[PDB]
Amino acid sequence: SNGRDSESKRLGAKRADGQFVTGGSILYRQRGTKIYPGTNVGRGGDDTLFAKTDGVVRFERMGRDKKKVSVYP
Amino acid sequence: LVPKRVKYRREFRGNMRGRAKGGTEVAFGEYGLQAVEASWITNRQIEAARIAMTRYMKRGGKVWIKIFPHKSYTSKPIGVRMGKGKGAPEGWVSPVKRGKIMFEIAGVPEDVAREALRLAAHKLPVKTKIVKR
Amino acid sequence: RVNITLECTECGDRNYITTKNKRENPERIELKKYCPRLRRVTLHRET
Amino acid sequence: ITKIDKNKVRKKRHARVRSKISGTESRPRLNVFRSNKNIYAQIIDDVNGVTLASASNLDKDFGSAESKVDAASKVGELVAKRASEKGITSVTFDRGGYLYHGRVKALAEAARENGLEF
Amino acid sequence: MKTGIHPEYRPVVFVDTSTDFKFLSGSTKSSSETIKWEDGNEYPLLRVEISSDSHPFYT
Amino acid sequence: NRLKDQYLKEIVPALMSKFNYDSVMEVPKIDKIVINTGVGDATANAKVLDSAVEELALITGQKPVITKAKNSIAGFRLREGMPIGAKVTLRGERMYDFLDKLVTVSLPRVRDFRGVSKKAFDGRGNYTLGVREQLIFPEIDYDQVSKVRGMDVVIVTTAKSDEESHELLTQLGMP
RNA sequence: GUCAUGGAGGUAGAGCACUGUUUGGACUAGGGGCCCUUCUCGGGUUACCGAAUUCAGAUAAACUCCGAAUGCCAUGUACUU
RNA sequence: CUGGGGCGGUCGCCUCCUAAAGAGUAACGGAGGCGCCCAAAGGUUCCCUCAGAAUGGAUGGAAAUCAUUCGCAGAGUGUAAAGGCACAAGGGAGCUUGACUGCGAGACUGACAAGUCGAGCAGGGACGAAAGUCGGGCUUAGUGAUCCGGUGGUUCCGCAUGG
RNA sequence: CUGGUAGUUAUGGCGAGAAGGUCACACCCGUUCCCAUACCGAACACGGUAGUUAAGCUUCUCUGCGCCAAUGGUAGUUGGGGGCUUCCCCCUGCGAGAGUAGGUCGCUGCCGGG
Ligand SMILES: [K+]
Ligand SMILES: [Mg+2]
Ligand SMILES: [Mg+2]
Ligand SMILES: [Mg+2]
Ligand SMILES: [Mg+2]
Ligand SMILES: [Mg+2]
Ligand SMILES: [Mg+2]
Ligand SMILES: [Mg+2]
Ligand SMILES: [Mg+2]
Ligand SMILES: [Mg+2]
């Protein structure tokens, strides 16, 4: 009666803290906001975080419990 | 001893590495039976050990069972090949790790405590030490 | 619930497919949609 | 029964506004505070965390009003002016959590009437 | 207060018949009867069963 | 206006002098009176509610708000939404008017009364006057109505203790 | 490849903050035994049951207030290859 | 397919555990869902805060609707589960149809076929005072290629030429 | 000193106690006007300043709850070795969670009035 599972969706970080990215680079794939859109970062319809401009990726604490990812030129 | 209900009917066997994380110092009683090596203790063995203890004390003093058989185990019948999914739940066990105090007694003199506990130890599949608070 | 096509009242063409529950919306749906032919918003009605 | 703290619940609404609106050096925030008596405007940079232009209902300049709305129009007129002098054009209006209606509206309408582009 | 939603709030005088006391208190249901007390500020009138002053538990 | 005046003339000091309050601000006042009907039968027939609203309106001189159920209960045969009972909140002058008509004209139309039932304070400072029937209120006329429903009258005070509340309701005239 | 630096990630361990499983004690609303006018409504009774409440104590692949070693991604004007 | 084969069960998609703290990872391993729904349950503007308990109170009961107090969430989120969400992503109301047309730097995923995200540009709009947000829905299932047929459109072709 | 508005993982919160006020800020008074309530001028909005620090606010005090937090030890574990092996031991490096000594009743801006 078991024997089922969905295809794995390859979630998680796609670029490293300190790595240079081009505009549109997906930074994080996620369900909901495990990580929040920081500065120069957008949240897509499926919660995907992407760089809005070229620059360097920085994963940062938001405050105590939450986390954000930013892109600094 | 059986859980009134369980979230999952089937459960990994697990492992028994390391010293018991809790219940290593005798807490409610004067004397305790301490597991020296690890083992699964079945509910049938806990009962056999309890009745042996309690009978010798002659409904005197108190007996705390400090282990509970939370974990189900399954078996396949004889004449059944491998596969076709996990077997039916057969029994209930408490994985006892080394250092875990399994039984505690109070309200009897040392001599009677120490005898009731050796009588219990002979029903358990694990090497035991008697320890006092 | 059914697939629906909205026809442009001016353009004539129907380049908008939608869906509706036809029990709850038995009438023909009317939406204002951009008509690419006319390059402006026009009333579109279910066929 | 407990009286509601009007400013506490106001400050809650202000947070909801400041969620979308924040001053920048190129384009600062025109924030309004409204009391039972008098009104106050500050043009702020949240990036630097510094108030540029500012104006109250109790500055030595313009101390003659008929109604609190007229009073609040004088403030807009003055904060617009004081901002233009400092050399800042495009702001974003921060309702401060107040309904964009009576006074705060009249402060904006007025500021907007002078050289401030929102 | 919204308009054209609630009925009239119009003031009206209540008077107990027995003790013959009078007091103003706005209410619905006019009845259209003149009053003696403060007739200049004319209000309707309502004849009433024993009030607090009359009722024996109170007095 | 007959009762509020009185509350501002010769209750405030009298009541401040009884408890010895530091400021007149501490003096208990009545915030709101809230009448609630509780038409549960309405789950069967909606027209029964229409009457229960119209009659309640006349009592308060202020159209009520038809309260809608919160959770689904099979026992009462009730489901999310569906109107059950009407609320109406009296504040200011139009409230004191009611309180007056409740303590002056309305209550001595019942068969009997003990008084300010000590058992009927919430323990915070607010009083709930349990009204048996609706023919107690003179703006009702039972020869123009079908069913009695009943009523529930909640009096919310600024008072901190039932003791402080009790004195205020007493000196306002409530039995 | 190593060094240095930054980062994502919840395993081992641990813990009980949540969810499930669970022991003992104290408390305490009910229900069930036992007589009474009684409608066993409520008393006088209670370790026959029992839901919360706390105190102490356990437990978890599909629990987590926590959380490694490693491994992984990257940066370097570092040293080797 | 299959701890020989048959019989039984299963076959695509989504969520979790197995899965060894990136990603991925098997078994006729352990658990559940899907083959839709919604004209608002979409967009935007504004406003809001839930479960439960205690106490008091007509019908009214353990439990309906009032009122106060305590309550980080013990609720809710169309629907499984996980991850999220109280500046709400939860709940009201007003106006609406962006559940737009042309696209798309660049990324993810990936044998291929496919799948996913996307700033920004142009056209013309909705809401908003503005800032701005809007190319459906908290997110991740709700689907099926080609060939062949049907219907609508069409500044394309039309077997000497016009059709 | 106080009002406004920011930053900062609550060392910033909660709770308890005290003091303060015409300069603000509040509550507060009123509904004619703009604008409001699915009923309610409660709120929102508008116009006021008789009354009051009671509350919010501000300042001060405290460690009851929370929060922060070493050192040491221990669990675990990379690499290298051994055993009698449900598992356990040794070497090297890393090193928790709990508990604890301790810390905390914030700190750091800019603008207006005084
Ligand atoms: K043995
Ligand atoms: Mg898989
Ligand atoms: Mg979508
Ligand atoms: Mg473990
Ligand atoms: Mg775990
Ligand atoms: Mg075989
Ligand atoms: Mg076989
Ligand atoms: Mg993984
Ligand atoms: Mg064809
Ligand atoms: Mg031809």
From Swiss-Prot, chain A:
Keywords: Ribonucleoprotein, Ribosomal protein. It comes from the Bacteria. GO terms for cellular component: cytosolic large ribosomal subunit. The keyword Ribosomal protein applies. One of its GO terms (molecular function) is structural constituent of ribosome. Belongs to the bacterial ribosomal protein bL27 family. This is Large ribosomal subunit protein bL27. It comes from Listeria monocytogenes serovar 1/2a (strain ATCC BAA-679 / EGD-e). The lineage of its organism: Bacteria, Bacillati, Bacillota, Bacilli, Bacillales. The gene is rpmA. The chain holds residues 19 to 91 of 96 of the full protein.
From Swiss-Prot, chain C:
Pfam families: Ribosomal_L33. One of its GO terms (cellular component) is cytoplasm. Keywords: Ribonucleoprotein, Ribosomal protein. It comes from the Bacteria. One of its GO terms (molecular function) is structural constituent of ribosome. One of its GO terms (biological process) is translation. Belongs to the bacterial ribosomal protein bL33 family. This is Large ribosomal subunit protein bL33A. It comes from Listeria monocytogenes serovar 1/2a (strain ATCC BAA-679 / EGD-e).
UniProtKB/Swiss-Prot annotation, chain D:
Disulfide bonds: none annotated. InterPro entries: Ribosomal_uL18_bac-type, Ribosomal_uL18_bac/euk. One of its GO terms (biological process) is translation. GO terms for molecular function: 5S rRNA binding; structural constituent of ribosome. GO terms for cellular component: cytosolic large ribosomal subunit. Residues 1-24 are annotated as: Disordered. Residues 8-19 have a biased composition (Basic residues). Keywords: Ribonucleoprotein, Ribosomal protein, RNA-binding, rRNA-binding. Part of the 50S ribosomal subunit; part of the 5S rRNA/L5/L18/L25 subcomplex. Contacts the 5S and 23S rRNAs. Belongs to the universal ribosomal protein uL18 family. This is one of the proteins that bind and probably mediate the attachment of the 5S RNA into the large ribosomal subunit, where it forms part of the central protuberance. PANTHER family: 39S RIBOSOMAL PROTEIN L18, MITOCHONDRIAL, LARGE RIBOSOMAL SUBUNIT PROTEIN UL18M. HAMAP family: Ribosomal_uL18_B. This is Large ribosomal subunit protein uL18.
UniProtKB/Swiss-Prot annotation, chain E:
Belongs to the bacterial ribosomal protein bL31 family. Type B subfamily. It comes from Listeria monocytogenes serovar 1/2a (strain ATCC BAA-679 / EGD-e). GO terms for biological process: translation. Part of the 50S ribosomal subunit. The keyword Transmembrane does not apply. This is Large ribosomal subunit protein bL31B. The chain holds residues 1 to 59 of 81 of the full protein. GO terms for molecular function: structural constituent of ribosome. Keywords: Ribonucleoprotein, Ribosomal protein. The keyword Cell inner membrane does not apply. Signal peptide: none annotated. GO terms for cellular component: ribonucleoprotein complex; ribosome. The gene is rpmE2.
